[PDB]
C-alpha cells in the first residue's frame, strides 16, 4: 500500500540492532503518539529502489552510505537539511559520506570497519601478517582446530586483502572519483586475490565458507580467528569466547585496507512523514540515549555522535575498529558502487572455486564494474 501518513516505517538490515532501534521507536511513540515500526526485510537495499520508485516503501531506510548515491540519482531520497548546530554534533567525515552532489542525502549513524577477531585462549599472539597464516593453520590443525574462517561469499570481507597491495575501486583525486580509472584487475589486486585463492588451494580455507559458517565456527571455539565488524561482537560475548579485536594482518608488508561504511538513515522522497522522520532521527536516535539503545542490542562501531563516541573510544575494540578504518578507505557513495560490488562478488567466488583464474575473474570484474560507463563512452558524442 501507499506509505501511511502519521507513523514511521523503518527498514534496517538483519545483522544490526533492530530490536534496540524499535526501543527508540517506542520512546518516540510514548512521547509523541507516533507509532514506529522497524522491519528487517531480506535484500532491503535492492527492494528500496524498486518500491520507492513507485512511491512506496519505508519512511526511513538504513544501509551503509555506499548505496545512497544511486538512490539519490534516481530521486528516491529527500534532501536532509539539519541546522548548523545539529551538524556540529556529528563528526565531519561522516557528513561527507552522505553528501552527494553537494547535498546531504542521509543522516550518518555509525562508522564500521572490519577487524581481526581472535580467540585469546587459542592464539594469545595473533599474527601480524597474512603470510604467517598457512603455517599458523598447520599448527592449529594439529591441535584439532584451524587458524582462520571468515565470510568468502561477500566481497566486503575479502576486499581488505585485495586492496592491500594496490587494488582499488575508483581512483580518488581532487575530492572526486574517476569512473574511467578502476583498480580491480591491477597487479596489487591480483596479488591479494591470488593469496586468498592459494589459502584455499592449500586447505587453509574453504571456498564455500559464508557468514553463518564462519560465525558458528569462531563462536564455538573451533577456529582461532575470524574477520568481522562490530555488529558481530555481542554474539561472541554470549558464546563466552575470550576474544580480542585487533589490526588486520598485513600483506606484503602493506596494511589490509577495509572499505569503511557509514551506517546511514535516508528519508524516502515519497514519504508523507518527512518532518516526523527528521524529528525521530535528529532528536531521538542521534542522542546518547538513542544510540546506546541500539548499541546495547548489536554494537554500532564508532558512532557519528561525538558526545557518545568519546565514551565508546575508550573501548579497545572501538580503537582497533578505527585503526583499521584509518588504514582503509571510505566507500564512495556514487551510483556505480553497486555495479562494482556485484562485479567483485562474482570475481572472488569464481576465483575461489577455481571456475576462473584470478586474472580472468578480475579482468571480467574490471569491465562489469564500469559496463554502463563504457556504454556511455561508446554511444557518446565525440570526434
Amino acid at each position: 500500500m501507499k506509505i501511511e501518513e502519521g507513523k514511521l516505517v523503518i527498514w534496517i538490515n538483519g545483522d544490526k540492532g533492530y530490536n534496540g532501534l524499535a526501543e527508540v521507536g517506542k520512546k518516540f511513540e510514548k512521547d509523541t503518539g507516533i507509532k514506529v515500526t522497524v522491519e528487517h526485510p531480506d535484500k532491503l537495499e535492492e527492494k528500496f529502489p524498486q518500491v520507492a520508485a513507485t512511491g512506496d516503501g519505508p519512511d526511513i531506510i538504513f544501509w551503509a552510505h555506499d548505496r545512497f548515491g544511486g538512490y539519490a540519482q534516481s530521486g528516491l531520497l529527500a534532501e536532509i537539511t539539519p541546522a548548523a548546530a545539529f551538524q556540529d554534533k556529528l563528526y565531519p567525515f561522516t557528513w561527507d559520506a552522505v553528501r552527494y552532489n553537494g547535498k546531504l542525502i542521509a543522516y550518518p549513524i555509525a562508522v564500521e570497519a572490519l577487524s581481526l577477531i581472535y580467540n585469546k585462549d587459542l592464539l594469545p599472539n595473533p599474527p601480524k601478517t597474512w603470510e604467517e597464516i598457512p603455517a599458523l593453520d598447520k599448527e592449529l590443525k594439529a591441535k584439532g582446530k584451524s587458524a582462520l574462517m571468515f565470510n568468502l561469499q561477500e566481497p566486503y570481507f575479502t576486499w581488505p586483502l585485495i586492496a592491500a597491495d594496490g587494488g582499488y575501486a575508483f581512483k580518488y583525486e581532487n575530492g572526486k572519483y574517476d569512473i574511467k580509472d578502476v583498480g580491480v584487475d591491477n597487479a596489487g589486486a591480483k596479488a591479494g586475490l591470488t593469496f586468498l585463492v592459494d589459502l584455499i588451494k592449500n586447505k587453509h580455507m574453504n571456498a564455500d565458507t559464508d557468514y553463518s559458517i564462519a560465525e558458528a565456527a569462531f563462536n564455538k571455539g573451533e577456529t582461532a580467528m575470524t574477520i568481522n565488524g562490530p555488529w558481530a561482537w555481542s554474539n561472541i560475548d554470549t558464546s563466552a569466547v575470550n576474544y580480542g579485536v585487533t589490526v588486520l594482518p598485513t600483506f606484503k608488508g602493506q596494511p589490509s585496507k577495509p572499505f569503511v561504511g557509514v551506517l546511514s538513515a535516508g528519508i524516502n522522497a515519497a514519504s508523507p512523514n518527512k518532518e516526523l522522520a527528521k524529528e525521530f532521527l535528529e532528536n531521538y536516535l542521534l542522542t546518547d540515549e538513542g544510540l546506546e539503545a541500539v548499541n546495547k542490542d548489536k554494537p554500532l562501531g564508532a558512532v557519528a555522535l561525538k558526545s557518545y563516541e568519546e565514551e565508546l573510544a575508550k573501548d579497545p575494540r572501538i580503537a582497533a575498529t578505527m585503526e583499521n578504518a584509518q588504514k582503509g578507505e571510505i566507500m564512495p557513495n556514487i551510483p556505480q558502487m553497486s555495479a562494482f560490488w556485484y562485479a567483485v562478488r562474482t570475481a572472488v567466488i569464481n576465483a575461489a572455486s577455481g571456475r576462473q583464474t584470478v586474472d580472468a575473474a578480475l579482468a571480467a570484474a574490471q569491465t562489469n564494474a564500469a559496463a554502463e560507463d563504457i556504454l556511455d563512452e561508446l554511444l557518446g558524442e565525440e570526434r
Binding site: A371, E372, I374, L375, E377, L378, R383
Partner: protein, 136 residues
C-alpha cells in the same frame, strides 16, 4: 587519443578494411561487418589500459538492453529538446534505440511531425530510425 575509427586508422597506418579491433567488453575480435557497422553508427573508440577497443554486436545489444531495462526514465517532444539545448534537432545526437545509429535530420523532423517523443536513457536521447521502422 583518437575517438573515431578513421582517425584511429590514420594513426595505426591502416584502413577500415584492414584494422583489427577487439570488443571492449568480451575482448573478442570484431567481424569485418562489425567494424563497418561500428563506423556507420558513429560509435566511439574506447580506451582501456591505453589500448583502443570497439564493441561487438552481441555485447552492444546485451549491455544496451540492460541499460534500457535498468535505467528507465522519461520522454520529451522534440521542441522541448530544442528548447532545453537551444540547438536544432539536426544539431543534437539522437540515436536509434534499436540499432544505435544516429537519427538523420529527416528522421528527427519526422518525429516532430508525427508528435512522437524521444526517450531518455541514462542521459542519452533516442528515437527509432526509418530502417528499424520498416522490418518484418
Amino acid at each position: 587519443r583518437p575517438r573515431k575509427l578513421p582517425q584511429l586508422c590514420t594513426e595505426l597506418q591502416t584502413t577500415i578494411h584492414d584494422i583489427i579491433l577487439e570488443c571492449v567488453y568480451c575482448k573478442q575480435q570484431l567481424l569485418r561487418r562489425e567494424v563497418y557497422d561500428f563506423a556507420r553508427r558513429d560509435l566511439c573508440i574506447v580506451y582501456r589500459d591505453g589500448n583502443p577497443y570497439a564493441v561487438c554486436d552481441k555485447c552492444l545489444k546485451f549491455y544496451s538492453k540492460i541499460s534500457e531495462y535498468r535505467h528507465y526514465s522519461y520522454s520529451l517532444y522534440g521542441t522541448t529538446l530544442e528548447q532545453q539545448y537551444n540547438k536544432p534537432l539536426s544539431d543534437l545526437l539522437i540515436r536509434c534505440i534499436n540499432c544505435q545509429k544516429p537519427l538523420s535530420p529527416e528522421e528527427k523532423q519526422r518525429h516532430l511531425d508525427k508528435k512522437q517523443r524521444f526517450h531518455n536513457i541514462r542521459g542519452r536521447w533516442t528515437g527509432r530510425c526509418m530502417s528499424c521502422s520498416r522490418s518484418s
